[PDB]
Enzyme design. Structure first.
Site, PDB file in Angstrom:
ATOM      1  N   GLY A  15       0.786  -1.248   0.000  1.00 38.40           N
ATOM      2  CA  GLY A  15       0.000   0.000   0.000  1.00 38.40           C
ATOM      3  C   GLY A  15       0.816   1.295   0.000  1.00 38.40           C
ATOM      4  O   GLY A  15       2.054   1.270  -0.031  1.00 38.40           O
ATOM      5  N   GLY A  20       5.032   1.337   6.964  1.00 40.08           N
ATOM      6  CA  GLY A  20       5.286   0.001   7.525  1.00 40.08           C
ATOM      7  C   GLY A  20       4.130  -0.572   8.347  1.00 40.08           C
ATOM      8  O   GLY A  20       4.242  -1.660   8.927  1.00 40.08           O
ATOM      9  N   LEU A  22       1.267  -1.555   7.183  1.00 38.77           N
ATOM     10  CA  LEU A  22       0.581  -2.625   6.427  1.00 38.77           C
ATOM     11  C   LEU A  22       1.548  -3.536   5.672  1.00 38.77           C
ATOM     12  O   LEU A  22       2.360  -3.088   4.869  1.00 38.77           O
ATOM     13  CB  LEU A  22      -0.410  -2.061   5.429  1.00 38.77           C
ATOM     14  CG  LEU A  22      -1.257  -3.041   4.601  1.00 38.77           C
ATOM     15  CD1 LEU A  22      -2.210  -3.872   5.490  1.00 38.77           C
ATOM     16  CD2 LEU A  22      -2.024  -2.207   3.545  1.00 38.77           C
ATOM     17  N   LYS A  37      -1.924  -5.743   9.591  1.00 32.34           N
ATOM     18  CA  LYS A  37      -1.849  -4.403  10.127  1.00 32.34           C
ATOM     19  C   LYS A  37      -0.966  -4.473  11.355  1.00 32.34           C
ATOM     20  O   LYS A  37      -1.163  -5.324  12.220  1.00 32.34           O
ATOM     21  CB  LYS A  37      -3.225  -3.904  10.545  1.00 32.34           C
ATOM     22  CG  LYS A  37      -4.129  -3.430   9.464  1.00 32.34           C
ATOM     23  CD  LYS A  37      -5.375  -2.763  10.068  1.00 32.34           C
ATOM     24  CE  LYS A  37      -5.149  -1.297  10.425  1.00 32.34           C
ATOM     25  NZ  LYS A  37      -6.434  -0.559  10.585  1.00 32.34           N
ATOM     26  N   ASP A 127     -15.602   7.329  10.013  1.00 33.07           N
ATOM     27  CA  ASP A 127     -14.410   7.459   9.190  1.00 33.07           C
ATOM     28  C   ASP A 127     -14.687   7.247   7.701  1.00 33.07           C
ATOM     29  O   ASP A 127     -13.894   6.609   6.993  1.00 33.07           O
ATOM     30  CB  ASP A 127     -13.323   6.478   9.673  1.00 33.07           C
ATOM     31  CG  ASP A 127     -11.929   6.928   9.298  1.00 33.07           C
ATOM     32  OD1 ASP A 127     -11.772   8.119   8.922  1.00 33.07           O
ATOM     33  OD2 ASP A 127     -10.997   6.098   9.400  1.00 33.07           O
TER      34      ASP A 127
HETATM   35  N1  LIG Z   1      -7.621  -5.590   4.129  1.00 33.98           N
HETATM   36  C1  LIG Z   1      -6.820  -4.903   3.358  1.00 33.98           C
HETATM   37  N2  LIG Z   1      -6.529  -5.379   2.148  1.00 33.98           N
HETATM   38  C2  LIG Z   1      -5.716  -4.549   1.478  1.00 33.98           C
HETATM   39  N3  LIG Z   1      -5.327  -4.868   0.262  1.00 33.98           N
HETATM   40  C3  LIG Z   1      -4.518  -4.151  -0.467  1.00 33.98           C
HETATM   41  C4  LIG Z   1      -3.365  -3.584   0.065  1.00 33.98           C
HETATM   42  C5  LIG Z   1      -2.541  -2.833  -0.759  1.00 33.98           C
HETATM   43  C6  LIG Z   1      -2.887  -2.692  -2.097  1.00 33.98           C
HETATM   44  C7  LIG Z   1      -4.019  -3.278  -2.631  1.00 33.98           C
HETATM   45 CL1  LIG Z   1      -4.427  -3.088  -4.312  1.00 33.98          CL
HETATM   46  C8  LIG Z   1      -4.846  -4.011  -1.804  1.00 33.98           C
HETATM   47  S1  LIG Z   1      -5.257  -3.126   2.417  1.00 33.98           S
HETATM   48  C9  LIG Z   1      -6.221  -3.657   3.687  1.00 33.98           C
HETATM   49  C10 LIG Z   1      -6.324  -2.938   5.038  1.00 33.98           C
HETATM   50  O1  LIG Z   1      -6.957  -3.424   5.972  1.00 33.98           O
HETATM   51  C11 LIG Z   1      -5.534  -1.662   5.237  1.00 33.98           C
HETATM   52  C12 LIG Z   1      -5.643  -0.612   4.310  1.00 33.98           C
HETATM   53  C13 LIG Z   1      -4.904   0.545   4.502  1.00 33.98           C
HETATM   54  C14 LIG Z   1      -4.093   0.659   5.633  1.00 33.98           C
HETATM   55  F1  LIG Z   1      -3.398   1.794   5.816  1.00 33.98           F
HETATM   56  C15 LIG Z   1      -4.001  -0.376   6.564  1.00 33.98           C
HETATM   57  C16 LIG Z   1      -4.711  -1.547   6.364  1.00 33.98           C
HETATM   58 MG   LIG Z   2      -7.804   5.624   8.423  1.00 38.35          MG
END
Ligand SMILES: Nc1[nH+]c(Nc2cccc(Cl)c2)sc1C(=O)c1ccc(F)cc1
Ligand SMILES: [Mg+2]
Ligand SMILES: [Cl-]
Ligand SMILES: [Cl-]
Ligand SMILES: [Mg+2]
EC number: 2.7.11.1
Length: 298
Positions: A15, A20, A22, A37, A127
């Site tokens: 992402g 860091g 995620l 996370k 949010d």
């Molecule tokens: N459950 C998911 N799935 C995700 N999939 C994802 C992550 C990076 C890129 C893409 Cl295209 C999809 S991100 C995410 C989440 O909980 C999240 C999203 C943003 C963040 F800052 C922390 C966690």
């Molecule tokens: Mg947020």
């Protein structure tokens, strides 16, 4: 370290933003990719455990990512959850920052329901923003489903012992996303169900217009910037903001006019949008504007 819980291998930072926070993960036991996370145990403002607890309260739900684990991972607390696809913000950019009405309606229909579900579990979300709504991944057969993530800012609006709606109050400090928040949020009022739905309205209009008219506002302090944005939201007639989208105007003045304690008529709001949808000859086929484009992964 290398692992979270018994069975999740910790992989790469994924992402944008995060810093860091995620990571890609893999369930080694199931051969499945997951989201991890991470929150430093040393965090001065811990949110991850309260988020986990909100997820447990939500339970298993349509468009709610599955949560697999919460626990320590080195000097972090980790929450392992279902890996989802790109956010509506990612997808908005991919579609040159406008969505068609059909796309916005298919999103809106789902997210009224998504919000009603959250509300049915005695939670308000607080949010709303395009970044917190993700499509699934093809692999999970839920790529078409708009999911809601990020419950760190949620709040139980029904007191579990008293079974009463939270009291009205004010002088609530502003933190959330200024762009979508309700006019009443700007005024420092306790958020309630109406506010999640109004923020949805704003986001819908953002998608349809490609921008909101208070989007460029800057100030020397956050508080002033929130003030100016709220001022502009108040100064922008619904009729003007929702020009060309009468049902959006109807949705927005209905949710704006909701009482603090009031149960929204989610059925009514859905029907505004499904009536419009049918009237335009749209078919609910999940053929969003982004379909056929090169989506970001994970
Ligand atoms: N459950 C998911 N799935 C995700 N999939 C994802 C992550 C990076 C890129 C893409 Cl295209 C999809 S991100 C995410 C989440 O909980 C999240 C999203 C943003 C963040 F800052 C922390 C966690
Ligand atoms: Mg947020
Ligand atoms: Cl739905
Ligand atoms: Cl169609
Ligand atoms: Mg599921």
């Amino acid at each position: 370290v290398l692992m979270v819980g018994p069975n999740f291998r910790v992989g790469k930072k994924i992402g944008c933003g995060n810093f860091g926070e995620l990571r890609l993960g893999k369930n080694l036991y199931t051969n499945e990719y997951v989201a991890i996370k991470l929150e430093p145990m040393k965090s001065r403002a811990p949110q991850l455990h309260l988020e986990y607890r909100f997820y447990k309260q939500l339970g298993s739900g349509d468009g709610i990512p599955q949560v697999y684990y919460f626990g320590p991972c080195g000097k972090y607390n980790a929450m392992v959850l279902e890996l989802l696809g790109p956010s509506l913000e990612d997808l908005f950019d991919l579609c040159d920052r406008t969505f068609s009405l059909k796309t916005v309606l298919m999103i809106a229909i789902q997210l009224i329901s998504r919000m009603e579900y959250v509300h049915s579990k005695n939670l308000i979300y607080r949010d709303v923003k395009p970044e917190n709504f993700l499509i699934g991944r093809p692999g999970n057969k839920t790529q078409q489903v708009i999911h809601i993530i990020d419950f760190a800012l949620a709040k139980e609006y029904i007191d579990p012992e008293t079974k009463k709606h939270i009291p009205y109050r004010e002088h609530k400090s502003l933190t959330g996303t200024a762009r979508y928040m309700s006019i009443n949020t700007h005024l420092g009022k306790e958020q309630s169900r109406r506010d999640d739905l109004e923020a949805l309205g704003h986001m819908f209009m953002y998608f349809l217009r490609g921008s909101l008219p208070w989007q460029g506002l800057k100030a020397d302090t956050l508080k002033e910037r929130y003030q100016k944005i709220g001022d502009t939201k108040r100064a922008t007639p619904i009729e003007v903001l929702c020009e060309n989208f009468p049902e959006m105007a109807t949705y927005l003045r209905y949710v704006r006019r909701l009482d603090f304690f009031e149960k929204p008529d989610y059925d009514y709001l859905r029907k505004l949008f499904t009536d419009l949808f049918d009237r335009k000859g749209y078919m609910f086929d999940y053929e969003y504007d982004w379909i056929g484009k090169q989506l970001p992964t994970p």
